[PDB]
Design an enzyme around this catalytic site. Structure first.
Site, PDB file in Angstrom:
ATOM      1  CG  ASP A  25      -1.932   1.075   1.359  1.00 40.91           C
ATOM      2  OD1 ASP A  25      -1.892   1.881   0.482  1.00 40.91           O
ATOM      3  OD2 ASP A  25      -2.847   1.023   2.204  1.00 40.91           O
ATOM      4  CB  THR A  26       2.479   3.065  -2.732  1.00 40.94           C
ATOM      5  OG1 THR A  26       1.096   3.259  -3.526  1.00 40.94           O
ATOM      6  CG2 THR A  26       3.145   2.194  -3.383  1.00 40.94           C
ATOM      7  N   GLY A  27      -0.063   4.261  -0.606  1.00 38.93           N
ATOM      8  CA  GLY A  27      -0.592   5.487   0.194  1.00 38.93           C
ATOM      9  C   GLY A  27      -0.743   5.273   1.480  1.00 38.93           C
TER      10      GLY A  27
HETATM   11  C1  LIG Z   1      -0.995   7.424   8.927  1.00 40.64           C
HETATM   12  N1  LIG Z   1      -1.734   7.332   7.976  1.00 40.64           N
HETATM   13  C2  LIG Z   1      -1.745   6.448   7.040  1.00 40.64           C
HETATM   14  O1  LIG Z   1      -0.737   5.870   6.668  1.00 40.64           O
HETATM   15  C3  LIG Z   1      -2.761   6.409   5.942  1.00 40.64           C
HETATM   16  C4  LIG Z   1      -3.117   4.988   5.616  1.00 40.64           C
HETATM   17  C5  LIG Z   1      -4.370   4.726   4.752  1.00 40.64           C
HETATM   18  O2  LIG Z   1      -5.356   4.647   5.262  1.00 40.64           O
HETATM   19  N2  LIG Z   1      -4.133   4.918   3.581  1.00 40.64           N
HETATM   20  C6  LIG Z   1      -4.996   5.013   2.441  1.00 40.64           C
HETATM   21  C7  LIG Z   1      -5.006   6.230   1.435  1.00 40.64           C
HETATM   22  C8  LIG Z   1      -5.068   7.499   2.373  1.00 40.64           C
HETATM   23  C9  LIG Z   1      -3.701   8.350   2.793  1.00 40.64           C
HETATM   24  C10 LIG Z   1      -4.153   9.181   3.834  1.00 40.64           C
HETATM   25  C11 LIG Z   1      -5.212   9.840   4.072  1.00 40.64           C
HETATM   26  C12 LIG Z   1      -6.499   9.026   3.795  1.00 40.64           C
HETATM   27  C13 LIG Z   1      -6.371   7.980   2.901  1.00 40.64           C
HETATM   28  C14 LIG Z   1      -4.817   3.669   1.509  1.00 40.64           C
HETATM   29  O3  LIG Z   1      -3.699   4.005   0.884  1.00 40.64           O
HETATM   30  C15 LIG Z   1      -6.023   3.540   0.492  1.00 40.64           C
HETATM   31  N3  LIG Z   1      -7.351   3.303   1.397  1.00 40.64           N
HETATM   32  C16 LIG Z   1      -7.467   1.634   1.257  1.00 40.64           C
HETATM   33  C17 LIG Z   1      -6.512   0.765   2.086  1.00 40.64           C
HETATM   34  C18 LIG Z   1      -6.659   1.126   3.636  1.00 40.64           C
HETATM   35  C19 LIG Z   1      -6.877  -0.316   2.781  1.00 40.64           C
HETATM   36  S1  LIG Z   1      -8.653   4.180   1.243  1.00 40.64           S
HETATM   37  O4  LIG Z   1      -9.377   3.840   2.358  1.00 40.64           O
HETATM   38  O5  LIG Z   1      -7.991   5.559   1.208  1.00 40.64           O
HETATM   39  C20 LIG Z   1      -9.466   4.078  -0.144  1.00 40.64           C
HETATM   40  C21 LIG Z   1      -9.047   4.456  -1.185  1.00 40.64           C
HETATM   41  C22 LIG Z   1      -9.925   4.235  -2.170  1.00 40.64           C
HETATM   42  C23 LIG Z   1     -11.068   3.603  -1.540  1.00 40.64           C
HETATM   43  O6  LIG Z   1     -10.731   3.331  -0.130  1.00 40.64           O
END
Ligand SMILES: CNC(=O)CCC(=O)N[C@@H](Cc1ccccc1)[C@H](O)CN(CC1CC1)S(=O)(=O)c1ccco1
Lengths: 99, 99
Positions: A25-27
């Protein structure tokens, strides 16, 4: 390996001696695993995602083998929707995005 | 190009008449953009991650340029804290993970 993104980039990891599936998970800044037991001390922490903040347990300097590549680093444990490998460990295993 | 993961993989995207910064996010099935008043029909949707779910508007077949690579697909619009480029568009621009 090179991994395309038509499917979720799920890989097998080994942590605390046990095999699990986890999402590359790069995000994600941090690595966050679903509720589990890990040895050693932990610290209460909070992290934010889409839809808000959760409480997690922060374990430091934890070895995980991610798709055959060794990492040792911070692992957060709490109510994530799925096990996620975040940038803190993706960098350790030499993972990059390419297009 | 190659993007290392020491920092968040934010890139410039173009959608509607707006340039924005968005995460190249292998952990995201869907592309989720911060609130913007796009023209056209949409359908209500719920999407979830760490801290639960948010309400979004689903727009289909929206052209979007990511790092100078053209894509066209479904874009979800809502109160996300960060713009997220999900696998639905990452595949279109030929993005892979490599280690
Ligand atoms: C300290 N916080 C983090 O590391 C963020 C972890 C995270 O939830 N990452 C999300 C993207 C993101 C980043 C920052 C703020 C909000 C969201 C993740 O990469 C993508 N998500 C799904 C993965 C957790 C399973 S998501 O909830 O954002 C998403 C994207 C599309 C539909 O749902």
């Amino acid at each position: 390996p090179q991994i395309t993104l038509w499917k979720r980039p799920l890989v097998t990891i080994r942590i605390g001696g046990q095999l699990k599936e986890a999402l590359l998970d790069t995000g994600a800044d941090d690595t966050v695993l679903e509720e589990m037991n890990l040895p050693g001390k932990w610290k209460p922490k909070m992290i934010g995602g889409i839809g808000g903040f959760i409480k997690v347990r922060q374990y430091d300097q934890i070895p995980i083998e991610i798709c055959g590549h060794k990492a040792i680093g911070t692992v957060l444990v709490g109510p994530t929707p799925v096990n996620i490998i975040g940038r803190n460990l993706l960098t350790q295993i030499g993972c990059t995005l390419n297009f």
